[PDB]
Design a protein around this nucleic acid. Structure first.
Ligand SMILES: Cc1cn([C@H]2C[C@H](O)[C@@H](COP(=O)(O)OP(=O)(O)OP(=O)(O)O)O2)c(=O)[nH]c1=O
Ligand SMILES: Cc1cn([C@H]2C[C@H](O)[C@@H](COP(=O)(O)OP(=O)(O)OP(=O)(O)O)O2)c(=O)[nH]c1=O
Ligand SMILES: Cc1cn([C@H]2C[C@H](O)[C@@H](COP(=O)(O)OP(=O)(O)OP(=O)(O)O)O2)c(=O)[nH]c1=O
Ligand SMILES: Cc1cn([C@H]2C[C@H](O)[C@@H](COP(=O)(O)OP(=O)(O)OP(=O)(O)O)O2)c(=O)[nH]c1=O
Ligand SMILES: [Mg+2]
Ligand SMILES: [Mg+2]
Ligand SMILES: [Mg+2]
Ligand SMILES: [Mg+2]
Lengths: 17, 271, 274, 276, 271, 241
DNA sequence: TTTTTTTTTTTTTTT
């Protein structure tokens, strides 16, 4: 339920794609 | 837990041997002395007057500049969009207002130059979107070991009086005897007569919509005011409405809003 | 059990020679029209949100503990035990303890912390509480086993968190616990939102039907005290005491004025004339 | 069966309209002018705001009914213990305020005046009090009527028998208590005074600030005004001592409305009549 | 089987169609509802002390003397001696119970026994001296007495929603089977906004305690309104709230009370 | 299309009349004219149509509901005029004109009687006026009635009452009826096919002008205000205006 | 060892 700051290394690039 | 007065010979001694400082305006820290262990801060303004921008700036200044573990629970947007907002605000640009600026940062490889400077020290923790949220905040505080927990947009979370009263009671009981700075963003009710909140009406303490228990359990209450239809639409005002620690309420200062970097800067406006 | 009132001749005598009110502090206009605080007496204290309930009741507890010899039992639920204990230590020594890091760092080095601790807690008159049916059991053990003369509750809205039957039964149980035991029972409550006009924090005078939750808060209380100040006005440190209800004497209205000291934390008897 | 014919009822009606009736009030003339006193088998309800004098009036009515009229009075006083409410009647008879003075208590201990004041009032077995479930309370009231033989019984503060009991729906418990209390008063033939409170108004002034009280202001249920025989309300404005009486319902006669005015005595504790 | 064809029904319709009991006071009632009929349930509604029992005692007196029909009173609210003295006072035009100088006068003058057999001389008036027991006693009245009118004073103290639905179905089945004219007094609920029913507010058909079957299983509802603390508490308004057998409803007439006599007699009042 | 309704001709212009296998609900307040409407519906579907109609009036007797039909066909309010009840006793001439066939089948456990009206008597319309003496015991009843109308394929009209409103006016003072306002349970709107409501100000300026509202319609779909009827107190026929 | 309807009474707020 709680997502750390390490889990978004490539997910932000996935959101910008 | 009936405890006599002789049993506190060493607990008081240990308790004696600190306010976390608000950035962006020095007028807040002069009349609040920061924030302590077990401190409920409430942040409010009108519809679209910039609550989340100021609280995002506060979280960004407490996360990477002061060394405190900050746990965000932004419920307006998802995890990806608030991470984009933090990265765009920290790198002094306006990210989601231009496709070319969003596309240029990956064509030269500097997108990996922005993730490592923020999310490498693990000072930030995020949450993805009522009695199930407190069991997650308890694991965020006791397990992960954070210091400032932020919650946003209470209107979706919450007869809409008993529910918000029990929510505020559980958040105050969680803040007490744990040692966490709990910031909660809430809204204001619609004005009945006179000028609206989008024109610069001076807000009262009883404008917190939903119940009256939003000021009976908060420790500090901060309100923002901006006249987006007036002569200066890029100027905000900060008003302390309640402070249990010191007792000084009123206008804290003035800050100039900017349309180029996304930051809102300390100003020197006079009245 | 029914009684005939001619058999009471030896108990009506004994209660005739027992009962004596405890004098309030900070204002002498309260003690003129309340005549103190007796055994079996629920005293309700209210104001707006942030107007000085806890400061007033904590000062009353300090003056009943260190000046009159009465054993006092606190049940402060807003703050922890160490916060209110530091509040009592800093308030007895006429300083402001928690709102200054320099004084807390100063008194821990030169060894004068023990001098401030012993002069309060030598005679063990203070007994504290660490945080609806086990609460009354802990207060009954605080009264019977320990032997405290005054019991203070704070922020009753946590205890009730339909709320109306809950707060009616709670007030009924506290009034029955105060009666036939001989304890002063101070209870602190809040106020509801006003309908139109101004706010209670802006200087609006409080009525007796503003006590939020039910009407049973004013129907089981003997003495009701209300505090009122304007945090946005010219003098935001001048509180007004209003006796809303008094069952024993029946005199209600404006008791007096008190001035708050931002340096020593003492709300003291002022000399303001309206 | 129970189908009594109206022809074979002559002797019952003859011995009914010959015997009771009377037992006037005290403090105001208009109450006795309208309601014609208190009768056996009735229910008189007395209401006010908070701390507005709904118990001083009733104890002042019980002192005159137990002293100047010789009626045995049973006081189920549930607000205060029997050590205060039986000592407040001493000074009320002797025209002082004994509980509100630490000097006079020591004076009557020393010189021996307390024995004279206790014997001048309680020389006859006329006051039978009660100290403290709604099942044993009506049993003690039935023992006061049957065993002790009390002519006037006063139930003070009925709010702490409907809120001190564990019931899901409070309304039906108030309804059951009211119909069982009316059945007790009608069966045993005793004057029964009931004291209760009022509810919060939705908007406007408060009942402690001069608001005229209506009949629908009774707190808790609707059986309070539907199963009572006389409803008396007391209203003042804390002139914080001028209190007016308002007969909200009279079942025996028909005349209702403002009965008169009373003035309180801060020195002696009596409710004298006024003139306005 | 229990089905009947409409062709083979000429005999039962011939003997069925081969006005009813008029009311006393406010002659716009029996001009509107055409009086009471056999096999009906009538409801009398008002607030506390507005005169429901006094509005039905006159009906029992005029239906037991001028009509000659057997009348069964069931005063659950009071005793039989009080309503008997009330009837003897109401027929003799002298208010009996509320005057003590005459309760002892007629017992020594000898004219009490003259007043007794003048109105109670026949076997007309039958009283009830205080769920299935009340129905059994009313059925015993109907069977062994031939009562044409049965009057019930308090429906609410029978209850120690479904228990009132069952009670009203059972009373309607009794009135339909035995064909008796049944009159029932009931109370009103507490209105939540505005005036009360005792201060001249008009009575609606919703404002009834207990359940909603009071208005769905009765043939007519009569409301009496008067302003108790007003300019005069004597002028009453009489309102028909429902009538199956005619259809026309509304304000019928007006009556005074005449405190010396106690007779609800009609008065002229336009508006 | 099916059988057409008489009075307020914006019903069969809107929902195209009744159909086989349906369960039609007629819901209003007390005194709004539910039985008066459905009695006209029963009269016009057994004289001008010729189909067998089975009435079940658990609320009154079998003689009054026939006297009102005989008075309704003859344009004379019979049960309220006391003089003409003995003037006509030409009673047989009025009786055999409208009951001369084997059309109507009145009624003085219930589902067996409805099945006997369908199979053993050939009824095409079956009318039930009172269901309140007939949650789970109402759900089972409504499922059994819907299964009966599904298997037998008969037009079915069922009348129930409305709930007591907790805030506002009453339905008798012209408060419009919503689909939630129904007693018993929630199956009254889940297992029927159409609901018709009448709203008239009973303690009002005119009580002879009803408003007709459609609350549900599975086939045509269009709901809302249909039309207005006047009552004609002399005759008693609901006629549109 | 659990989900839905009906109804009278006290409080706190909402466009
Ligand atoms: C009495 C008083 C206190 N103060 C300061 C000192 C206190 O530390 C601070 C308020 O603290 P508290 O007195 O504890 O606040 P409160 O109990 O009235 O309200 P709540 O518990 O609902 O939050 O205000 C003033 O500024 N002026 C005054 O007159
Ligand atoms: C009657 C009256 C009493 N008083 C004083 C005398 C009494 O000691 C005090 C009220 O005492 P009580 O009459 O006992 O108060 P109460 O019963 O109306 O309220 P509650 O039981 O709900 O608490 O007020 C007046 O000042 N003016 C008056 O007119
Ligand atoms: C109708 C009417 C009655 N009265 C008086 C005379 C009667 O003795 C007195 C009793 O009224 P009731 O007829 O007993 O009133 P009620 O039965 O509706 O109320 P409840 O049973 O709930 O107590 O009312 C008037 O003064 N004026 C009037 O117009
Ligand atoms: C439709 C209508 C009826 N009426 C009157 C005339 C009839 O005699 C009277 C009877 O209506 P009913 O059909 O008997 O009313 P109802 O069956 O819905 O009520 P309930 O079963 O609950 O008792 O209604 C009017 O006055 N105007 C009208 O528009
Ligand atoms: Mg506090
Ligand atoms: Mg009292
Ligand atoms: Mg009556
Ligand atoms: Mg019908």
């Amino acid at each position: 339920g709680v997502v750390s700051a390490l889990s978004l290394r490539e997910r932000i690039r996935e959101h910008l794609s | 837990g009936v405890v006599s007065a002789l049993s506190l010979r060493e607990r008081i001694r240990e308790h004696l041997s600190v306010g976390l400082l608000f950035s962006g305006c020095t007028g807040i820290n002069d009349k609040t002395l920061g924030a302590r262990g077990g401190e409920v801060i409430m942040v409010t303004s009108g519809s679209g007057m910039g609550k989340s921008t100021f609280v995002r700036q506060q979280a960004l200044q407490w996360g990477t500049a002061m060394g405190k573990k900050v746990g965000l629970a932004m419920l307006q947007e998802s995890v990806e969009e608030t991470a984009e907002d933090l990265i765009g605000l920290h790198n002094r640009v306006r990210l989601r207002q231009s496709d070319s600026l969003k596309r240029e940062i990956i064509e030269n490889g500097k997108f990996d130059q922005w993730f490592d400077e923020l999310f490498g020290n693990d000072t930030f923790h995020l949450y993805d979107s009522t009695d199930r949220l407190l069991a997650k905040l308890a694991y965020m505080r006791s397990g992960l070991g954070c210091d400032v927990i932020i919650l946003d947009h209470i209107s979706i979370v919450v007869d809409e009086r008993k529910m918000i009263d029990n929510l505020m009671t559980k958040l105050k009981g969680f803040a007490k005897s744990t040692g966490v700075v709990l910031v909660v963003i809430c809204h204001l009710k619609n004005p009945d007569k006179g000028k609206a909140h989008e024109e610069g009406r001076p807000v009262s303490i009883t404008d917190l919509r939903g119940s009256g228990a939003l000021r009976q359990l908060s420790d500090t209450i901060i309100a923002l005011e901006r006249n987006q239809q007036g002569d200066m639409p890029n100027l905000v005002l900060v008003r302390i409405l309640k402070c249990r620690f010191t007792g000084d309420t009123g206008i804290a200062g003035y800050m100039e809003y900017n349309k180029e970097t996304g930051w809102l800067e300390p100003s020197s406006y006079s009245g």
